[PDB]
Each structure stands twice: as C-alpha cells, then as structure tokens.
Amino acid sequence: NIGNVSMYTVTLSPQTKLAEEIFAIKVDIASHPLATTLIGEIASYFTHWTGSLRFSFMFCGTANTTLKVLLAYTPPGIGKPRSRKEAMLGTHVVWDVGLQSTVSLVVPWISASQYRFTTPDTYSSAGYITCWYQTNFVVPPNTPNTAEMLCFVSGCKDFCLRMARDTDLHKQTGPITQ
Amino acid sequence: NIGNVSMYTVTLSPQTKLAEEIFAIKVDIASHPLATTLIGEIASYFTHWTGSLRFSFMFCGTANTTLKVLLAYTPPGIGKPRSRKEAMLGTHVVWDVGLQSTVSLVVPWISASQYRFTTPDTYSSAGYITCWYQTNFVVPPNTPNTAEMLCFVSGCKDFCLRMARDTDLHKQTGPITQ
Amino acid sequence: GAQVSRQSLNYFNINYFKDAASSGASRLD
Amino acid sequence: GAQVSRQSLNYFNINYFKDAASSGASRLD
Amino acid sequence: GAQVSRQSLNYFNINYFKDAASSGASRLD
Amino acid sequence: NPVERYVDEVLNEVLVVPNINQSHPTTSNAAPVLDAAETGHTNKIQPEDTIETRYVQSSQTLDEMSVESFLGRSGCIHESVLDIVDNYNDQSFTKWNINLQEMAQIRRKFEMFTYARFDSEITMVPSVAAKDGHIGHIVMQYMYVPPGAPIPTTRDDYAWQSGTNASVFWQHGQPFPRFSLPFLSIASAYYMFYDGYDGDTYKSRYGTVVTNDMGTLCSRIVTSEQLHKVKVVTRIYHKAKHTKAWCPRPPRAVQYSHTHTTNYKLSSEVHNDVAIRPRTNLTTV
Amino acid sequence: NPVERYVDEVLNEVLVVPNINQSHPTTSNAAPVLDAAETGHTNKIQPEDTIETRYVQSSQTLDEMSVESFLGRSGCIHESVLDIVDNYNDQSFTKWNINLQEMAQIRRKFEMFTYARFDSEITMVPSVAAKDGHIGHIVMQYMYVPPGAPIPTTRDDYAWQSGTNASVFWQHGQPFPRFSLPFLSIASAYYMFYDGYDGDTYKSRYGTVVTNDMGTLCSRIVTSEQLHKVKVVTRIYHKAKHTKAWCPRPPRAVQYSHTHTTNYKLSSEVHNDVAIRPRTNLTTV
Amino acid sequence: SDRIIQITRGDSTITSQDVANAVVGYGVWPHYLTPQDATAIDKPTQPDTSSNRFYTLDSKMWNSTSKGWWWKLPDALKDMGIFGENMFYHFLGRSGYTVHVQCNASKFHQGTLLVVMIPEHQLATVNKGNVNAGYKYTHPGEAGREVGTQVENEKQPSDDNWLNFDGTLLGNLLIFPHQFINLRSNNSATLIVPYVNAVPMDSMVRHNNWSLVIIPVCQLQSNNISNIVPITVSISPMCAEFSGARAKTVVQ
Amino acid sequence: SDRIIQITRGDSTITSQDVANAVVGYGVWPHYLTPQDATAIDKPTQPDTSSNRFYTLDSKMWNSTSKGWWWKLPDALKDMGIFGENMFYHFLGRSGYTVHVQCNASKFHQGTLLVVMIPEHQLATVNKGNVNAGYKYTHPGEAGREVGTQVENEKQPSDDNWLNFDGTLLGNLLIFPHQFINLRSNNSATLIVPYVNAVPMDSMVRHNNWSLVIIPVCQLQSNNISNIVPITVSISPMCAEFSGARAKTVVQ
Ligand SMILES: Cc1cc(CCCOc2c(C)cc(-c3noc(C(F)(F)F)n3)cc2C)on1
Ligand SMILES: Cc1cc(CCCOc2c(C)cc(-c3noc(C(F)(F)F)n3)cc2C)on1
Ligand SMILES: [Zn+2]
Ligand SMILES: [Zn+2]
C-alpha cells in the first residue's frame, strides 16, 4: 500500500464471524505508523512527550450503511488484547455510525512517570489502540459491500514535548547541490 | 569471622577468673574496626573530625541471664589499660543487664586541639574503649551458657567532619564496563 | 542600554550593541 | 538578573544566564 | 558582595568569591 | 511585573499547559465524541469528556516548543574548503553563493513554514589541517559581497580592500568568529516556498531561487604563500533570532536533491524513499 | 537579612552545631544511658548525661557536610579516546553511551542515596598527544545525541550538522569547555537504585539500565586529516548543582564490576574483598 | 502499657504483648496521592478495607543455622485477595504498608533478628559478569527466599547476607527503617512505611518498591531445641490505589 | 438532538445516533446504600470506576427464526474484570446498572425487539412436577440463554417466550422497565435500573436480582438476508459496593 492513497484507509465489510479485529497499532506518538503524521513528525524533534492523544475516525461508506465498532486503548503492563472482550476491559468508546461521520477516542495520559521517551523505548511504551466490530457492517440490497474509514490524530490540551533533538525521520546521504 | 554475621557479635559467658577483659578497640572514628561503620565510612570522606561519640551495646542473651559489665574510655597519653582497675580510673559506665537491653557509653571529646585527623595519625589518636566483667555472667540451670552482644556507634550533637577528601575505604583497580 | 527592573530583585536586560539584530533570543508569546 | 541587598553592605547575587541550571552551588538549609 | 561607601567618593570593596580566604590582603591595625 | 516575567524566563514557565479536571459519569444526548471531520475542523474533545478523570495540576510548559526555540539552535549550513594542493594563488581563495538550502537538518525545520522572518547569528568554525607538518601563522578573511558588488577573481583583487563590504578577519588561535545580521529581505518575510517565476515564458526560473538571492561569501587565506601546504575548512553555522513564521506545512518526507527546489527522486520501491516502515498487516503492532 | 545570610556564606557558618553545657553529678531513677535498640531508634543520650561536663561554646559548622557540598565537587566520569593509528576516517570520531557508572569515586558517593535530583555542570579536559611531532590546528566537536536522534556513522555524517542537538566546539589553545544541564529525568528524581525490570519475563532487564538512559555523546576531530598522527583524550568531569537526595544507604563495600548493576565478585578469601582489616583477636587494638 | 500493641486494618486486628515500640519509615505516614504530585489522569480505584487489611504469608522455621529470609513488595502480596487482584488488572498501583513480624519463644531462649525494610533493594549476582538477577528470582511471592538453600542457577541473586545481597555491609542496614526482635525483649516488630518512589504511581508487576529482609544476627539457642520456633509475617497495604484498568495481566 | 446519546461510565463511553430516549427503572436512579437502610456493619468496598464501567458480552446473531435471549445479573458479569472479582471475594454485593442493547441494520430492514429488565424473574419448568430450574441453568454467564436451542434436561427452565418462561403472558412484560428496538426507528435501547430487593445487600452468587430478556416480537426481514445482523449487549454496574470480604468463592 505504501505509495498509494490506500495506505491511509481501513476497509470495513459484512462479517461472518462475530467481534473480529479491525486494526491494531501502538499508541506511542513517534512509533510507526504514527511517526509520519504531523504530530508524530514534530514529536520526533523532541526527546520527551506527555499528555493525552486524540484519535478520530471518519466513516467513508454510503449514507445507508450502518455499523457499530469498539475502539479501545490498552494501558501498558500487558500484551495487546487478543479479543474484543479482552480489549473492552480497558479504556474504550463504542462508535455508532450515523449522521455524524466522525468519532473520537481519547488516549488519556496514563503513565507512571510524568513524561515518556518519544523514541521506541521499552520502559516508556504507552500501550495500544485496537478496533473491533461491536455489531456488524450492514447494508441494504444494491449497496457496495465494503467501505473505507479514515483515521486522524492530534494532541489534547495536555499534550507537550520536551528536549529538542534532531529527527531520525529524515536524512541526507549526499551533497544537496545547485 | 570476616564474611560471617558473627563478625558483628561479641560472646559473653560465665568466668572462672574475675574482672576479665572482653574487648578493646581504638576510639578513632576512622580506624579499624570502626572504619566500615556508616559514621566511619562518612568520616573517611573528610580529613578532620571532632565531637563526642556514642557507643551502644545490646545484650542478646536470654531474659533469665544476668550480667554486670564495665565499659571504659581511656583518654590518650597512656597505653590501653591492662586491667579493669586501670581502665575504671578513666571515663566509664557500669552496665547492668535487665529489662532494657541496651546501654550507651559516650566518649566525650577530650582533645588538646579542636579537631583531629580522621586518618590514623599518632598526634591525634583519641584513646581506647575497653570492656570488662564487673561481676559475672550468671544463668539458672538449663539455660545456654553463652550469649551474644551487639555493638553500635553514632555521633553526638557535637560531632562534626571537615575538609572533604576521597576515601581510601574503596578503590577501582580496573575498568568498570557495560 | 539597560532595562533595569526592581522588586530587591533588580533585573538588568542589557543590549551591548546598538542594533536590535545583535541581541539574544527573544522572549515568549 | 541581580538580587541586590543592602545594609552599607550591598549584596549582588547575579545570574548571568537565563537558566536556573546555569547558576552556581546552592545555599544551605 | 560589595561594601559600598559614600562621601561623591563611593568606595566599592568587592568580594568576587564566596569564601573569606579568597579575598586580597587585609587592612591594617 | 518585569521581574515576575524574569523568573518565568529563568524557570522556563512562561507558557503553561492547562490542568485536567475531575470529571464524572454522564448520560446525555450531547455527544462530544461525535463530530464531522468534513468540516475541516479538529474535534475539540478533551479527556474529561470520554472518561472519568481525576484532578491533576499540570506542570509542563510549552516554552521549548516555541518557534523561537525550534529555529533558535545553531546548525551547519556550509562547509567551505580552501585546499592548497599545487598552486597557492589559485587555491588560497574561494566563493560561495549563500543559501540556507545545502544542509538538510536546518533546511527541513525552516521549510515547516511557508514564510519566516528573523535576524541571523552566524558563527564560523575554521580548522587548519597541517598537510606537511606546520601551519605557520594563519589569518583568514571572510567578505560578504552583496548582489552587485564586485567579486574578487584573484587572491589580490582590489575587492578584498573591502572599502564598503563587511569583512571579518580571524586569526588562528583566537576564538571563533561570530556576528549578527538583520532581517535582509526586500519583502516582509523570507519565502520558504514560492509558486512563481521570474518571467512568463517556458524558460523562466521557478521557485525560491527567484526570490532568495543573498549574495556571495568570499574568503581567502590572508597569509601569503608558506612552505607547508594546509587545508582550511571553514564551517558556517546559522541560527534564527527574533523569529516569526507563517502557514505551517507538511514536513519534507523524502531526501532533498537540490537547492531552492522541492524536486525529489523515487526508486522502483518507494517504501525505501520514505520514513514509513512497511506493516506486516493492519493488526500487527 | 539577605546580607547577614551573605556573611554566613562567606564564613561558612550557616549550620552551627550546639554547645556542650555544664552538667552535674546525678542520682536518679531516670537512666538515660539505658534503652532498647530493638525499637530501631538511636539512643539520643548526650555527653552531659554520662559525665560531668563543662560549658563549651561550639564553633564548628556543618556547612561542608551538606549534600550540596558532598556531591558538589567535579570528578571524572569518562575518558574518551580518539587515537589516529592508520585510518583517519575510522579513527577520528567516536561515541559514548552516557552514564555516571564508569568511575568509582563519584559513583560511590551518589550511590549513598536511593534517589537524587540535581542539575549538572560538565567540564571537559582535552589533551592532544603529538605522536609524530606536531599537532597542527586541532578543533574538536562534541555533540549530544539524545535517545532517538540519529547517531553519526562516519566523520562526515549529516548528523554532525547538529541542526537541533547541542554541540560544543573547542579549539586547542582555548580554555576548557564547560556547560550546565538541567535535571534531565522523565521522573521527579534520578534512580540511584531500581529494583524493577522493563518487562515480566525471564529475559527482561533488571536495574537502573532500565530507567537511566541518557543518550549518546558523539565526538570527532573537526580538523581534516593531517600528516602527523595525534591521540586526543578528552576527559569528562561532572558535578551536581542544586542537589537533593533521599533515603540514605550503606556505602559500596566491594569493588564495582559493571555499570547499572550492583553485581560484585568474591575471591576464596573474602577478607581481601572488603576494607575490613582482620583483627588478631577481640582485645588487640 | 508501652509493651502492648493492637493494630486494626480493615477486618483484621493484630496484637502483641511484647513490642519494642513501632517504626514509621522516614517519619512519613502513608497517604493517598495528591493532585499536585499525580501524573496519570484517570480517576484511581481505592478498595479501602477490602485491600487495606493484614495478609499473613507462609510461616518460616528459624533454627540454629538459619542465614535469613527476604520478601519483596508488592510481589509478596500478588496472590492476596482483592489487593492481589488489583495489582494485575491495573497498569499502575500505589501503596504503603504496615509490616508486623511475629516470633515468640521463651524466657529461656535467646536469639536476635534484624528486621529491615529497604527501598529499591536492587539485588546483585556474584562472579557472573554483567548478568543480573532474573525476574523469576526476585518475584518469589509469599514464599519469599530462604538464604542458603536455592541450588544455584546463572540468573540467581547473591545469597551473601553479610553483604546485603547487594555489595554493601550488613552492619549498615540500620540506616534503613528497621527493628530487632531480641527474644529476651520482644516477640514482634512493627514497621509502617509510606509509598517511596521517584514517580507517584508505578507498575506493581515489574517494580518492587520495598524489600523486607530478616537476618538472624544473634543465633537462636535454648536447651529445648526440639520445639520449633517459627517466624510469621503479616503485611497490610495502606491507602492502596490503582489506575489504568484493563484485562488481568498474567505473568510467566 | 434527541436522537443521539452518549453514556460515559468509568473509562468507557458508548454512543448511539438513533435512540428512543432512555428508561430509568421505576424512576429511581441508582445510589449507594444509606446508613438508615443498611444492616451489615462492616465498611463496604466501592471500586468506583474500576467496576462501574461498560462490559460488553458476547454478541448474538438475530435471524428470521430467533425466539429470543435472556441473561441474568449479576451472573452475566461474573467474569468481568474487577466487578466480577468483587462478587466472589465478598459475601454481599449491591449494584445498579446501565444496560445498553445494540442492534443496527438498514433503512430497508424491519424487525422489532422487546427489551425488558425483570426484577426477581423466577423461572419455571414445564411438565416436570415440582422440579425447579437448576442453578447451572440460571447461571449461564455472559453467554446467556438462546431460546429454542438447548437440548432438554430435567432441570432445564421453560423455553416458552410467549409465557415469559414463568407462566405469564408476554404481552404484559411492558409493565416492567422496557424499550423496543424497532429497526425503522432506533438502533439501540438504554435502560438504567437501581438496586431492587427486599434486603439492602445480597449474595451476588446465589441471587440474580435482574433478568434481561430480549424477544423479537416483529420478525427480522429484508431483501439482503446474507448480511448478518448481530445484537450486542453492554452493561455497566453503578454504585457497585461489596461487603464481607474473605477468600474467593469457587462455583461448581
Ligand atoms: C531565506 C534566507 C535567509 C538567508 C540569510 C542567510 C545568511 O547568509 C549570510 C551569511 C551566512 C553570512 C553573511 C556575511 N556578512 O559578513 C560576512 C563576513 F564576515 F563573512 F564577511 N558574512 C551574509 C549573509 C546574507 O539566506 N536565505
Ligand atoms: C543518573 C544520571 C544523570 C545523568 C546525566 C549525566 C550527564 O550526562 C551528560 C553529559 C555528560 C554531557 C551531555 C552533553 N550535552 O551537550 C554536550 C556537548 F557539548 F558535549 F555536545 N554534552 C549531556 C548529558 C545528558 O546520567 N545518569
Ligand atoms: Zn614543525
Ligand atoms: Zn614540528
């Protein structure tokens, strides 16, 4: 997908098995795939970070397509949830698709220390965001059987970066000439 | 005894000869065996010391074991006492073992100069602490015929260290690696 | 060229050269 | 950045840089 | 650390370091 | 209080972040978590709205994240080389078409904005390599030749007189030279990007090369020819002071290839050209 | 009085010790000399209670015994070596995983506390050894690469641009470089000891290596290759400023063996591994 | 009487008619995290009396050759009722403790136990280079570790009681909150310690804040050795609070 | 908009953009036990946000032949995080609930679910004399009971949805707190019920206070039957409090 707009969308569709997993990524603001987002890129210019993260999702399907999904944040000290039931026990939002296309899940700052390292460091890995089918993707007849979803990220009022450093998300391996 | 907890205890028992000597050490806060105590270790980070020292002793025998002991401090300018009578002429405390397990002997600051060197230096050697049987170690039948005693040390309100210096109670003879 | 303050905590914001470009990093907000 | 005192014995506690880390050893107690 | 005098002839006896040992030669009598 | 503000500067507590307040369970038809990204606005929902939070007094400050701080660190922008190999007259002087586009690190940071206005602090780090053993007495001359001023063509060109241009003489052994420059543009701000040309024909130039001419930095070893050959490399460092930036933009995602242009190159496997790391699949953290 | 306190600083009489008062003969059923160490408290008996003392005005001060004073002396924490032997490009730069665990003297003092919070003063002492005769013009670059920042892999790596990282350039002949660092932890204090891991499996790391990552100190000889080879050794010195310590602990009793760990080694005759000197017997002073 | 003590925590009450007073570590009584020192923003859970109660561990047998015992908190309570449940369902935990060590014999017995509470007791390994104590070994649970028994393994911690299992001399442990159980004087020790750490809350699973060390400095002796003299430990969390709820963490 | 709802409990927030308002059983909002009504004298434990959060059960599949489903509380949450742990470590428990049933389809689907919360739903057996429903059968857990599937056993409960599984007519269930999920109007149902019992607190193990019954009264129909239409249940305890702590009870 890299090098194509599709790398930005997640596909949803009618399921035959219940509570299937949709996506899963680390919450760490500077880890992949969050790294190249604007907040991830800026975070990569600092050594420390703190604060709550705001993840938003916009359903791109038809107006007649319905869906209920469960978005969960798993605080650290445990592996990523292997099931919806396991994920649901943590911080989560049940998203009902309707007139308002977008939903937001806030990943509260839940850490032992006031700050964490922006670079992938064991001690300060902040947890995961997983997405699961709460009910199912349902459509009337003669309607596309799949739909896309866009995912956004930004920081909350308490987000903050510290200790300026050079980024490793960009390099120069030769002379830049005239 | 070094390398065993027994290096910290002094054994007492019924005597057949009167006024026997129990232990004898220099009072100098940084001399051996006082050197590795916390106050001795800290004193070893300075060049000068002054003030009164507090030596305490806790009887570890049975509740039915009795004993009277004489703890003495011999100010300098004379050799360590060769007998209880000789020691008793100096600063001392007669300790009676009873409900209160611990006794304290204060070694008052008795010096020509306001301070002394912490390192073993003739001119500033502060004297000795000796311990002698005042009466005897007595027990009823069917009771262990020996008992241990623990010895403590700390400084009084007038204790003070001066002129910071590196310690010779610890070294590095090679590289400390990762 | 000193912006002497008082409080006593007397602040002394000195500009050694006669050009604005010469002074150090700016204050915030 | 001077904490000018007076008594006349005028104390001048000066902080040459704008960071707390930059100043010398702290006062006691 | 300045013992500022006045008369105007303002004397400025400054001690640059925080130790008495650091200052220069003593005054007489 | 000009003194209370002083303390905030020393402690770096000028820009404080808000506290998190205690929140409670809710049941309402007001749903903050729901919105519409189509509007182009970011949902302003905070943690107190999605979970029951406790009260917490924030102590973080945004000072270090200020534009002044982000662009206020001295970075290398040029590495001038004077290498005496076999002809002192030809090799003891050189020139550079000034620009902030040759080094990726500082270039990327400035380019995170469309326009920027700032004064500059230039610091030079000269280092004399003794190729044959000694370095003798090295004295350097750096002269700023604004566009239009005569450019020296020999180590003794009359232009080195610097009757009007600013020149800085450095003597080996003395501290690193440094000076300040006021905002230099003929416009109100420097163009980090410029979607325009210097004409209207197929041969007109495109980009910032049209608006960012800064002149030439000429330099020479003042010291006359010496027995032992040296190689003097002067590295130039730049820092922005008293800065303002406008219209933030996406960070450079691929390597730079040339100055004053956003041109880039792509390989047959584009994932190698960007910092994005291939994921095994959607659910592999 | 901010001026009376000033005098105490100059004279070092901020923390005075109490006087000894005259005491007299006593006969009472209140026995201060008797107590119970089992309680875990130290008998607070003073000399006036065990002997008849005279009155004495104390003049000693505890200033020098303060934590600020104890940990406020600059000691060596690293000895960086750049030795040009046969390949300038490979040998003219190096890196160090920063830590305060490699030199026993300052390490032991900090480790007499469980937690410590302080700012740092780093002072560098570079010395250029002329292996072949001359040293030419030596210019050094020291760059702090915080965890995450790109680490240079060649003497000309773009990272040396230091567009954001702090770098200090020193020129041989100029005074020793020095700078201050603010308390750097993501926690409220540095862990001198840490009874924890970075996971919960048999392969998780144990100790301060988990909490004390400080990044890398990269350095290079800025000067390009010279005829005569040199060996530059830069010794780094550290000092704590504005210090606070918590929970004192037993001093290191055996030699250190590795960084971030309390591990130690014992010989077949342990009395040789500790400062304790064997006594002939209980009564031999 | 100053020889008697009654400690009530939750639904538990412990007594001793021969105490040597009590110790409050660093003179700070345990208290809940305040908003000025807190960092995690979700509302904490405070089980109160269902977690702040005395939990009695497995008793140990003290004999003439015992070299000592140690436990680590909160590890030792990982399987103790509600408190234990809470330390695994949450990422963060915070707690103080009341440690009551029990040991009685007779007025014809003698022996002395040094009871210590050490903050950040980072164990060492001996003659094993930079290999450190394995997670498994510093997480023995209520069973604790019996000094001088474990059949050595590479990742096994130091078992030298005279060197505090960490390269420091035993005689100086008194600088930490402590008490002695001198059979002739008392039959118990009581230490109340507050939460101590460089962060307001922490992982109860991967960070042991306190370590309880018990070393017999004065050997157990009597003329009735057949009568077993046990040592029993009862610990009660105080102001226990947890944060960052989720599924239950499973170790190993 | 009165069609939208957001419910936040602990660290969970649930939304629905097509609700039919909400119901508060008997108009009484859940609240903690007061000292005037309490009988047990030990201080209760109140997990607060670690227990008063939404727990999502296993989803069910609704099809043209579905006869219905039922769950019992607190049984259904016996294995749900801290709440579950608390109901087994204590003798007594007390809790209210926010029950949010979820079911979406399309504007071209039709079907109607009667969602009911019954207090003391004492199940019956059919044609089996005085033999009553076995403990095992009225304690199915989060899986609940699927009407019309279970292969009959002697102690198995009545499976007649038209007789409310208890000898009363379905049409009258509306006298209990309830809502309908009429596919053409809403995609969820929300019921908030207070603690209801003849005693202030009770055994969470042997007494199920409320029963959640879901019966499709209007059959599910559409011209796209292959698209599975699930029904999902999320329940959040409210003012959960427990008393009489001890070891953890193990059932069966
Ligand atoms: C956009 C934008 C803004 C700028 C200005 C870059 C600064 O460039 C310089 C430098 C590096 C040095 C001098 C300079 N002035 O005097 C000297 C001397 F001492 F070197 F002669 N050098 C002048 C300019 C405009 O370039 N692009
Ligand atoms: C605990 C504890 C606390 C610390 C901090 C040790 C200080 O380490 C350094 C040093 C020695 C130098 C720099 C440094 N910053 O800039 C430079 C430059 F000039 F060398 F680039 N060096 C940064 C840190 C964090 O390490 N362990
Ligand atoms: Zn020469
Ligand atoms: Zn030479």
Give the DSSP letter string of I70-137: EEEETGGGTTSHHHHHHHHHEEEEEEEEEEEEE----TT-EEEEEEEEEET-----SSSTTPPPPGGG
Partners of D16 on chain F (C-beta within 8 Å) are none
Q: Considering only residues 14 to 43 of chain F, which have any Cβ-Cβ distance to chain D shorter than 8 Å?
A: none
Cis peptide before A141 (omega within 30 of 0): no
For F264-277, b/e burial (b = at least 16 CB within 10 A) is eeeeeeeeebbbbe
Partners of F241 on chain C (C-beta within 8 Å) are 21, 23-26
- Say how many CA atoms lie within 13 Å of F172 toward its Cβ: 25
Q: Is the CB of G166 within 6 Å of ligand 2?
A: yes
Question: What distance in Å separates residue G90's CA from the closest CA in chain F?
Answer: 17
Q: Kind of pairing, strands H23-24 and H145-146?
A: unpaired
CB atoms within 10 A of CB H3: 13
Tokens of H57: 């561990």
Tell me which chains share at least 3 CB pairs under 8 Å with chain F. A, C, D, G, H, I
DSSP state, I158?
A: P
Q: Residues 6 or more apart from H179 whose CB is under 8 A from it? A: G38, G39, G40, H20, H23, H101, H115, H189, H190, H191
Residue H101 and residue H182: Cα distance in Å, rounded? 12
Q: Does any CB of chain E come closer than 8 Å to the CB of residue G9? A: yes
Quote the Cα angle for G149-G153-G156, to 5°. 100
CB atoms within 10 A of CB A100: 20
Residue B29 and residue B153: Cα distance in Å, rounded? 9
Q: Which residues on neighbouring strands pair with residue D2, listed in sequence order?
A: C10, D14
Read off the amino acid at residue H152.
E
Burial of B75 (0-12, 13-18, 19+ CB in 10 A): middle
Helix, strand, coil shares, percent, chain F, to 5: 15, 30, 55
**Residue G109 near residue G100 (C-beta atoms within 8 A):** no
Q: Is the CB of F189 within 6 Å of ligand 1?
A: no
Q: Residues 6 or more apart from G109 whose CB is under 8 A from it? A: B45, G70, G71
**In this complex, how many residue pairs, one in chain F and one in chain G, have their CB atoms less than 8 Å apart?**
80
**Residue H78 near residue F96 (C-beta atoms within 8 A):** no
- Ligand 2 centroid–CA G107 distance in Å is 15
**Residue F52 near residue I11 (C-beta atoms within 8 A):** yes
**Residue B169 near residue G107 (C-beta atoms within 8 A):** no
Smallest CA separation from ligand 2 atom 11, residue: G122
Read off the amino acid at residue I89.
Y
- Per the rule left: phi > 0, alpha: psi between -120 and 50, beta: everything else, A126 is alpha
Identify residues of C whose CB sits under 8 angstroms from chain D CBs.
8-12
**Residue H249 near residue H242 (C-beta atoms within 8 A):** no
DSSP state, G258?
A: B
User: What domains are defined for chain G?
Assistant: 1-285 (2.60.120.20)
Instruction: Tell me whether chains H and E touch (3+ CB pairs under 8 A).
Output: no
Residue F273 and residue F254: Cα distance in Å, rounded? 6
Q: Is the CB of G98 within 6 Å of ligand 2?
A: yes
Phi, psi for residue G4 in degrees, rounded to 5:
-75, -35
Q: Residues 6 or more apart from I99 whose CB is under 8 A from it? A: I115, I117, I189, I190, I191, I192, I193, I212, I233, I234, I235
Q: What is the DSSP string of A119-155?
A: S--GGG---EEEEEESS--B--TTS-S-EEEEEEEEE
CA dihedral H140, H144, H149, H152 (to 10 degrees): 30
Structural element, H or E, at residue H98 = strand H90-102
A30, A163, A171: residue with CB nearest G146: A163
Residue F74 and residue G227: Cα distance in Å, rounded? 31
| Alpha helices (runs of H) in chain G, residue ranges in sequence order | 4-11, 47-50, 67-70, 88-91, 104-110
State how far the alpha carbon of H5 is from the alpha carbons of H17, H100, I217, in Å: 7, 11, 67
Q: Does any CB of chain D come closer than 8 Å to the CB of residue F169? A: no
- Per the rule left: phi > 0, alpha: psi between -120 and 50, beta: everything else, B64 is alpha
Tell me which chains share at least 3 CB pairs under 8 Å with chain I. A, F, H
Question: What distance in Å separates residue A49's CA from the closest CA in chain H?
Answer: 13
Q: Which residues on neighbouring strands pair with residue I93, listed in sequence order?
A: I202, I242
CB atoms within 10 A of CB I6: 23
Question: What distance in Å separates residue G183's CA from the closest CA in chain H?
Answer: 13
Closest CA to F138 of F233, F216, F217: F233
Residue I47 and residue F281: Cα distance in Å, rounded? 38
Burial of G88 (0-12, 13-18, 19+ CB in 10 A): middle
Q: State the method.
A: X-ray
Closest CA to G180 of G117, G116, G120: G120
DSSP state, I41?
A: -
The CATH code that applies to domain I1-252 is 2.60.120.20
Q: Is the CB of G84 within 6 Å of ligand 2?
A: no
Nearest-Cα residue of chain H relative to residue I240: H47
Q: Residues 6 or more apart from G141 whose CB is under 8 A from it? A: G160, G162, G167, G168, G169, G219, G220, G222
Tokens of A161: 């970066």
Closest CA to H193 of H250, H244, H117: H117
Q: Which residues on neighbouring strands pair with residue G167, listed in sequence order?
A: G143
Closest CA to F274 of F242, F238, F250: F250
Tell me which chains share at least 3 CB pairs under 8 Å with chain B. G, H
Structural element, H or E, at residue F120 = strand F113-130
For B128-137, b/e burial (b = at least 16 CB within 10 A) is bbbbbbbebb
Read off the amino acid at residue I110.
Q
Tokens of C2: 């000193």
The CATH code that applies to domain A1-178 is 2.60.120.20
CB atoms within 10 A of CB F24: 10
- Per the rule left: phi > 0, alpha: psi between -120 and 50, beta: everything else, F75 is beta
Q: Is the CB of G124 within 6 Å of ligand 2?
A: no
Tokens of G273: 């591994």
For E4-26, b/e burial (b = at least 16 CB within 10 A) is eeeeeeeeeeebeeeeeeeeeee
Phi, psi for residue H172 in degrees, rounded to 5:
-100, 5
**Residue G115 near residue G191 (C-beta atoms within 8 A):** yes
Place of tokens 């409990």: I9
Best mutation site among F56, F57, F59, F60 for testing chain H: the one with the most H CBs within 10 Å?
Answer: F56
Tokens of G267: 């010989």
Best mutation site among G71, G119, G185, G239 for testing chain D: the one with the most D CBs within 10 Å?
Answer: G119
Residue G39 and residue B98: Cα distance in Å, rounded? 16
Structural element, H or E, at residue B42 = helix B38-43
Q: Residues 6 or more apart from F23 whose CB is under 8 A from it? A: F47, F48, F49, F51, F52, F53, I8
Cis peptide before A175 (omega within 30 of 0): no
> Which ligand has the minimum distance to the alpha carbon of residue F243?
1
Q: Do C12 and D4 touch (CB under 8 A)?
A: no
